[PDB]
Design a protein around this ligand. Structure first.
Ligand SMILES: *[C@@H]1O[C@H](CO)[C@@H](O[C@@H]2O[C@H](CO)[C@@H](O[C@H]3O[C@H](CO[C@H]4O[C@H](CO)[C@@H](O)[C@H](O)[C@@H]4O)[C@@H](O)[C@H](O[C@@H]4O[C@H](CO)[C@@H](O)[C@H](O)[C@@H]4O)[C@@H]3O)[C@H](O)[C@H]2NC(C)=O)[C@H](O)[C@H]1NC(C)=O
Ligand SMILES: *[C@@H]1O[C@H](CO)[C@@H](O[C@@H]2O[C@H](CO)[C@@H](O[C@H]3O[C@H](CO[C@H]4O[C@H](CO)[C@@H](O)[C@H](O)[C@@H]4O)[C@@H](O)[C@H](O[C@@H]4O[C@H](CO)[C@@H](O)[C@H](O)[C@@H]4O)[C@@H]3O)[C@H](O)[C@H]2NC(C)=O)[C@H](O)[C@H]1NC(C)=O
Ligand SMILES: *[C@@H]1O[C@H](CO)[C@@H](O[C@@H]2O[C@H](CO)[C@@H](O[C@H]3O[C@H](CO[C@H]4O[C@H](CO)[C@@H](O)[C@H](O)[C@@H]4O)[C@@H](O)[C@H](O[C@@H]4O[C@H](CO)[C@@H](O)[C@H](O)[C@@H]4O)[C@@H]3O)[C@H](O)[C@H]2NC(C)=O)[C@H](O)[C@H]1NC(C)=O
Ligand SMILES: *[C@H]1O[C@H](CO)[C@@H](O[C@@H]2O[C@H](CO)[C@@H](O[C@@H]3O[C@H](CO)[C@@H](O)[C@H](O)[C@@H]3O)[C@H](O)[C@H]2NC(C)=O)[C@H](O)[C@H]1NC(C)=O
Ligand SMILES: *[C@H]1O[C@H](CO)[C@@H](O[C@@H]2O[C@H](CO)[C@@H](O[C@@H]3O[C@H](CO)[C@@H](O)[C@H](O)[C@@H]3O)[C@H](O)[C@H]2NC(C)=O)[C@H](O)[C@H]1NC(C)=O
Ligand SMILES: *[C@H]1O[C@H](CO)[C@@H](O[C@@H]2O[C@H](CO)[C@@H](O[C@@H]3O[C@H](CO)[C@@H](O)[C@H](O)[C@@H]3O)[C@H](O)[C@H]2NC(C)=O)[C@H](O)[C@H]1NC(C)=O
Ligand SMILES: CC(=O)N[C@H]1[C@H]([C@H](O)[C@H](O)CO)O[C@@](OC[C@H]2O[C@@H](O)[C@H](O)[C@@H](O)[C@H]2O)(C(=O)O)C[C@@H]1O
Ligand SMILES: CC(=O)N[C@H]1[C@H]([C@H](O)[C@H](O)CO)O[C@@](OC[C@H]2O[C@@H](O)[C@H](O)[C@@H](O)[C@H]2O)(C(=O)O)C[C@@H]1O
Ligand SMILES: CC(=O)N[C@H]1[C@H]([C@H](O)[C@H](O)CO)O[C@@](OC[C@H]2O[C@@H](O)[C@H](O)[C@@H](O)[C@H]2O)(C(=O)O)C[C@@H]1O
Ligand SMILES: *[C@@H]1O[C@H](CO)[C@@H](O[C@@H]2O[C@H](CO)[C@@H](O)[C@H](O)[C@H]2NC(C)=O)[C@H](O)[C@H]1NC(C)=O
Ligand SMILES: *[C@@H]1O[C@H](CO)[C@@H](O[C@@H]2O[C@H](CO)[C@@H](O)[C@H](O)[C@H]2NC(C)=O)[C@H](O)[C@H]1NC(C)=O
Ligand SMILES: *[C@@H]1O[C@H](CO)[C@@H](O[C@@H]2O[C@H](CO)[C@@H](O)[C@H](O)[C@H]2NC(C)=O)[C@H](O)[C@H]1NC(C)=O
Ligand SMILES: *[C@@H]1O[C@H](CO)[C@@H](O)[C@H](O)[C@H]1NC(C)=O
Ligand SMILES: *[C@@H]1O[C@H](CO)[C@@H](O)[C@H](O)[C@H]1NC(C)=O
Ligand SMILES: *[C@@H]1O[C@H](CO)[C@@H](O)[C@H](O)[C@H]1NC(C)=O
Ligand SMILES: *[C@@H]1O[C@H](CO)[C@@H](O)[C@H](O)[C@H]1NC(C)=O
Ligand SMILES: *[C@@H]1O[C@H](CO)[C@@H](O)[C@H](O)[C@H]1NC(C)=O
Ligand SMILES: *[C@@H]1O[C@H](CO)[C@@H](O)[C@H](O)[C@H]1NC(C)=O
Lengths: 321, 162, 321, 162, 162, 321
């Protein structure tokens, strides 16, 4: 008669690593690393992202005629932009402090576009001929929809002195610009005055832009350049414009109605018709694992990213052969 | 293993013991069979469960990368940003992988220890009323029927009675 | 007769955590995390901090008339500034490279103010009427005490050509500025000349400032703006000014006599009449613990900051009930 | 615990043993009492003390945050700065908390090991001159007076004499 | 050590045992000598070797500093860069030093455990055919010639034969 | 008759540390930290570094006459520059975006210098008298060899309108500059025209530089200043210059033929006539250790840097005395 002491074995082939031994077969183990995703861009807890598709943030905000899909976009959870969107600045140039603005958008979930300087209210200047073949719409020469390219009227460009007041409660994103013409002849042809400027003032801002003449390469068929600028106009503050040529005036500006958690995600993927609590640039994640290895840039309630291929904890004991 | 029981003086585990991590096998004239030791098994389940949760909990506050863009003449700070992000991922990857390796070793040893202690608990009861065979088993000098066997699992084996 | 082996127990209720078990009662333990502070701003090893109170670094350095307490401050250990000091730039404007200067102060413990261009030495310009209602002192219109706001004298502003030489051994912090007037009428009213400049030169510096006219919002009752600039003048180097209007000239500059470990601390607290070897923005620390959890920004010989609520090491053994 | 002694085959500690972490209790016709084992106790005090100092020392070189300010159009690098500072605090917080959890486990097991070894040191002396009771105690076959008891604590228990 | 064998109940190692980490010494009428236990020795060499490689491997993906220069009015980001670089070096220095301290402790205990288990493997064979002396040695009740000794090292010591 | 169980001892004095005990003597140990280097700068896998010696990156690239050793340098593995090279900008001034350019070089292993605007091709301007005593060569006044300092010819400086086209396949590093004269008299003396500019245009670039007059300290005997600029000209893109004075024109530009892993190392050491797989600023490393403590800035296949003095792993067991 005997009594023996012993331990459990089973048919398990699960393996764990240790410092002194790799591939130890154990009776039970627990994987803690999520390796799968759905490969789609999804709504984040019901709230759909802004998918700019072929438009860039600049094309969207300035109102590139090719980006009319985004003329009035609802509240978003995150933003998705391709690596090299084709519809950026149709008319060539620069967007000043562009990256600082994009960073500002990571704290914004909703814009409401409003009209601050009506197109018709330009009585001493021509405001309906500010177009170019570089920004076509339906086969015709058009232009950035949110700013007005003003030119001389009856052979004169009188000094502009406009002011807008932020009466509404929400911070306002105001966008304007300046045209750099190709030569002295083009300058007088469009604006009469040879030496011009645009002065912009707010509570904080004290700007004075001057056009910069230069022989330049053609880009999208244009020699001229457009340099765009922006500011955040506080509540109860007024923006003050003064110019005698080359002024690209604001028509529409954006109210910042919702602030909060957001991000600009770089991805070539389109919309997936899908929902998730955790999103990455290559697909959404749905699991209870404490870790994943899909991609470091996530948004939502996510597991923690690690660069491992495998994380498996032993729970049971060394299994017998 | 460190404690010598699992795949040591006990050559291998038991496919036949289904209801616990550790336990007893008995053999007498009435028959034979397996019985799980509830107490040591439950202590093991609690320890491993606390460990897993402890591991999950400690890694819950960890670096999260964010998108930042830089122009063509901001390459230095772009590079700084890249190296910072990557640096933390490498630190956390290291932390996770090492914790798993280290605690897997401790978990396997923990089980070995629980088996060894269970074997000693029984050895300390039987004392000189049984031959210690060397393989996890004790061979009795007297007939040990099922209620005699139960008393050994009890912690109640009345040594002076035999 | 028997002999038994055993271990110590006691009345201890101290608890430690482990990976597999929380709240294990032990016979002895050692807390290693400091959780307390005194809630005061204190001297750091005898040396009192500079407590700017309602003044900012700019108000202090430029000599805002409301900041006369700090007209000649002794050596400091660290600097304490509120989050939003009221006495900053009384006359509205900007302070150029302000954050880079504040960073420079974290390596400075003592300034000695000296006179480089006497107020009386302006013989061809009016130097005693450079005042504003925005910078009041005792009910009267005053101005930043360390710089001279020069205006036309007997209807003329002749070109200024001044030079100062850093003969003294210590690097010199020189501060100047430029006035941006509201309109062309104000420009001629103050400075005669319509088109003006300020050119500044040192061994390294090659600056040319031009005023920027613009209709602007009123700030502290002023339309005009002041933009301030600075430089570190090396020993044996000369700073060269040239201007024909809008020049805010240096009167006093600061010698950098002591360099060393310092910091600018953000805190609403005032002076505590106290001494310590370790200071945080919410109070001082006095302990031998290797860790604390008060605040990450400390100065002095401090424990290491962690975000824990509890760090307790077992020394003794598992205590019996 | 891993070594089976503390709150294992020795059910509980002794309020009565004041002058050491581990030791002996004896009972004979002359009386009874506790005596601390100086050597094992002092080895324990040295180990735990070195551990604490080792922990303190390793954490002495660790990240210190510094104040840096940024204007309204330097938000990206301000954010970079914030994430860097926070990232290191999270790394060091993790390091501290994990070290404490891990070494607390090792410290408790260390004590258990010292007790187990002390019990074995005595078991290996007495051999067959005493009944191993199963609870930390040995019951002698001969009368063991106080000097007999002292010899067991000595390491000198003359086995052949009995 | 935790397992009580090395510099415990076995007072010291053997200069005379050259061909292994652990083994046997025998003494009888025919003579005396040392013999390494191949199996436990080789298990030890494999474990320590895997450990070293594991340590080297885990530290292979670690922060690398790069040169970045900044002008006189970029002191803030220069300082940010410096603190980032230094921060990671301090983290990796800590990781390396701690891993070495912790695993050195585990390695020493591992050896102690292997010795203790080897001693138990032999104890469980001899059972009552030998006096357990208390110092690592077993004194036989019968004459044990060289082939008798070999059988103890074998794992084959025919207990019932004696 | 007896059989004993035991363990190995030997004559080893090697020591390892543990958490509970320092200086434990063990039978075997393994050092894992490399502490030695050769103290020399070496070839990296056969490929010699660019050792600028007394020249800076600016002196080398602009073609400082003292830096003729580096007039045509072969492919390099890394670059070595002293902390304060003496031969930098012989004629005083600034190098714009200098640090961003140096960062660009860490991704470059080979330049091939080519001629884009021949010196002789300046038919309406004097191109052979653009020299200074600040940039001497063999006792005579010379100048940066890669750019041409143009001045008036027969008392006139007509407007310059030059263009270069990047026909070759490789990105091109183009360098130019602008001269800031001491006073109005010097301006007319060198360039006739009182008000001048340099306009530069590419596909992206839209620059307009104006000289800045100012009384300045003498540096290397010069009152004037030179401010240098650069750009990367893409393939198939043209750079467009226009100026009427103060223009420092490109003669030679650099083709970027090899991109790849490189670095700029700061070191006072000269060439060692040596080879290695791992290099640091204070010497090369040759070992199989996983760690070293020589210097954090390395290049090549290196061990990992730690700040330890000692890392030794126990392999064997506690050795007996
Ligand atoms: C700096 O100089 C460079 C090099 O000269 C300039 O780039 C060149 O610009 C010229 C025009 O100024 C272009 O000319 C033409 O070439 C294309 C070639 O088309 C195909 O064939 C070639 C085979 O050699 C192949 O390599 C190309 O990839 C391509 O498949 C012509 O097609 C084009 O003519 C077109 O004809 C079509 C109908 O036949 C029309 O619809 C089109 O509208 C168009 O007229 C044209 O004649 C060069 O292609 C171009 N690149 C070179 C030579 O490598 C560069 O522009 C200049 N810089 C600046 C800023 O201008
Ligand atoms: C862009 O436009 C906005 C909106 O119009 C401008 O802000 C507004 O500026 C005007 C002056 O141009 C201010 O007018 C007055 O309003 C205050 C209101 O006082 C109390 O009552 C209202 C109740 O509606 C309450 O909301 C306020 O919070 C406050 O408690 C008057 O007190 C003030 O008159 C004063 O009278 C005192 C004696 O009675 C005098 O001592 C004072 O000196 C002063 O004269 C004045 O008449 C608006 O308050 C102001 N905000 C609004 C309407 O929301 C903004 O200025 C403009 N931009 C720029 C750059 O100018
Ligand atoms: C701001 O002002 C400062 C202070 O005045 C200017 O620095 C000074 O500049 C002057 C010239 O303007 C220099 O004058 C001369 O001094 C040196 C001194 O030489 C030795 O002796 C002194 C002992 O007092 C010692 O401290 C020096 O270190 C040095 O060993 C003269 O040698 C020099 O004359 C030379 O004579 C040589 C033949 O004898 C010639 O070959 C040389 O070419 C040269 O003519 C000259 O007369 C001061 O040295 C200098 N520093 C002072 C006084 O501390 C500074 O220039 C100004 N700023 C600007 C931007 O100009
Ligand atoms: C663990 O197991 C031992 C042995 O199996 C238990 O002892 C046995 O306990 C049972 C149930 O209490 C006893 O049954 C009783 O029998 C008497 C008369 O025979 C009857 O009057 C009662 O109604 C009941 O049926 C049995 O006698 C007893 N046998 C022995 C040998 O002890 C013990 O209770 C268990 N202990 C623990 C801590 O689980
Ligand atoms: C540990 O304890 C044992 C037993 O208590 C010690 O042995 C005893 O040692 C004492 C003191 O040395 C001896 O006392 C001596 O007695 C003789 C004659 O009786 C006398 O001539 C001396 O002046 C002295 O008083 C005692 O005899 C002795 N007894 C026995 C049974 O051994 C032992 O010395 C201790 N060993 C260690 C390592 O601490
Ligand atoms: C471990 O050691 C034991 C004891 O040394 C081994 O047993 C011995 O094995 C040898 C070699 O196989 C035997 O030698 C044989 O002897 C017989 C007759 O004497 C002869 O017919 C054969 O040709 C051979 O020479 C020896 O008898 C035997 N002795 C005993 C006491 O068992 C055993 O084989 C070893 N086992 C292992 C697992 O290594
Ligand atoms: C408001 C206005 O003047 N629009 C013009 C525009 C501007 O004058 C010019 O872009 C300013 O720099 O020029 C447009 O013509 C230029 C255009 O001419 C085509 O024939 C050709 O296809 C193109 O290469 C280009 O040179 C323009 O389309 O942009 C006309 C527009 O009405
Ligand atoms: C040196 C000088 O000219 N000081 C004037 C000052 C400047 O002319 C002006 O600030 C330049 O921009 O203007 C002062 O008057 C402006 C002031 O007028 C008050 O009536 C009113 O209370 C204010 O709103 C403001 O418009 C000034 O006080 O700043 C007079 C000063 O002497
Ligand atoms: C192209 C040209 O004009 N070269 C001149 C040069 C420039 O005019 C000047 O640097 C522009 O700022 O000036 C040179 O003379 C200045 C020189 O005079 C010496 O006598 C003296 O030794 C120096 O201190 C310095 O003032 C020059 O050498 O740079 C002459 C050069 O030909
Ligand atoms: C541990 O087991 C894993 C099995 O997953 C081994 O990994 C594979 O190794 C084979 C070599 O025969 C390769 O062909 C496969 O590509 C590997 N697969 C993966 C997913 O890594 C691993 O080699 C084993 N390690 C040790 C030390 O034995
Ligand atoms: C370990 O004990 C601590 C006691 O400090 C427990 O923490 C408290 O838990 C109670 C729940 O009954 C809460 O109401 C308190 O707010 C907690 N206090 C603190 C300071 O955290 C803790 O819950 C225990 N943990 C476990 C796992 O038993
Ligand atoms: C462990 O041993 C080392 C020997 O390398 C000791 O380090 C030396 O300590 C002496 C003190 O007598 C100093 O004079 C030397 O400068 C030290 N040398 C080095 C390289 O550090 C160390 O002190 C010992 N540590 C302990 C805790 O005993
Ligand atoms: C392994 O055994 C389990 C019993 O727990 C059973 O559910 C499963 O079907 C078996 N699988 C294989 C492959 O034998
Ligand atoms: C998430 O995955 C689980 C699998 O555990 C699945 O049952 C469930 O459908 C998924 N939930 C969502 C919201 O996609
Ligand atoms: C606990 O016991 C200690 C003896 O070490 C004594 O000093 C203390 O007063 C006691 N405290 C309580 C609450 O019993
Ligand atoms: C620091 O705290 C200790 C308590 O340990 C106290 O005795 C001492 O007064 C304090 N020292 C100072 C300088 O405040
Ligand atoms: C130590 O012993 C080894 C044998 O492994 C021998 O090679 C060496 O020469 C000895 N060294 C000393 C100093 O005794
Ligand atoms: C590297 O060091 C080894 C020493 O292990 C030496 O034998 C060899 O010559 C060295 N190799 C080179 C390429 O310098």
């Amino acid at each position: 008669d005997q009594i023996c002491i012993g331990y459990h074995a089973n048919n398990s082939t699960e393996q764990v690593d240790t410092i002194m031994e790799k591939n130890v077969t154990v009776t039970h183990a627990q994987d803690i690393l999520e390796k799968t995703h759905n490969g789609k861009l999804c709504d984040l807890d019901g709230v759909k992202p802004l998918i700019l598709r072929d438009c860039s943030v600049a094309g969207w905000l300035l109102g590139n005629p090719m980006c009319d899909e985004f003329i009035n976009v609802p509240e978003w959870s995150y933003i998705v932009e391709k690596a090299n969107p084709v519809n950026d600045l149709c008319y060539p140039g620069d967007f000043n402090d562009y990256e600082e603005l994009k960073h500002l958008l990571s704290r914004i979930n909703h814009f409401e576009k409003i009209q601050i300087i009506p197109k018709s209210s330009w009585s001493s200047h021509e405001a309906s001929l500010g177009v170019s073949s570089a920004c076509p719409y339906q086969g015709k020469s058009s232009f950035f929809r949110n700013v007005v390219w003003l030119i001389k009227k009856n052979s004169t460009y009188p000094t502009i002195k406009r002011s807008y007041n932020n009466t509404n409660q929400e911070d306002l994103l105001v966008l304007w610009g300046i045209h750099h013409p190709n030569d002295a002849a083009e300058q007088t042809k469009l604006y009469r005055n040879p030496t011009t400027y645009i002065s912009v003032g707010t509570s904080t801002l004290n700007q004075r832009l001057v056009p910069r003449i230069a022989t330049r390469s053609k880009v999208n068929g244009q020699n001229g350049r457009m340099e765009f600028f922006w500011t955040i106009l506080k509540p109860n503050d007024a923006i003050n414009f003064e110019s005698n040529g080359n002024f690209i005036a604001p028509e529409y500006a954006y109210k910042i109605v919702k602030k909060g958690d957001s991000t600009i995600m770089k991805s070539e993927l389109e919309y997936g018709n899908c929902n998730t609590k955790c999103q990455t640039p290559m697909g959404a994640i749905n699991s209870s694992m404490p870790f994943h290895n899909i991609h470091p840039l996530t948004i939502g309630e996510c597991p923690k990213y690690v660069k491992s291929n495998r994380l498996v904890l032993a729970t049971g004991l060394r299994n017998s052969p | 293993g460190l404690f010598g029981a699992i795949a040591g003086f006990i050559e291998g585990g038991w496919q036949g013991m289904v209801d616990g991590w550790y336990g007893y096998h008995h053999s007498n004239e009435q028959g034979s069979g397996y019985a799980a030791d509830k107490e040591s098994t439950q202590k093991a389940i609690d320890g491993v469960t606390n460990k897993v949760n402890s591991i999950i909990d400690k890694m819950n506050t960890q670096f999260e990368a964010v998108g930042r863009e830089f122009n063509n003449l901001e390459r230095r700070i772009e590079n700084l940003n890249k190296k910072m992000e990557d640096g933390f991922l490498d630190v956390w990857t290291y932390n996770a992988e090492l914790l798993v390796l280290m605690e897997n070793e401790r978990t396997l040893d923990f089980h070995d220890s629980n088996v060894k202690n269970l074997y000693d608990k029984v050895r300390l009861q039987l004392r000189d009323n049984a031959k210690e065979l060397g393989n996890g088993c004790f061979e009795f000098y007297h007939k040990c029927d099922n209620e005699c066997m139960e008393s050994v699992r009890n912690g109640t084996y009345d040594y002076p009675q035999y």
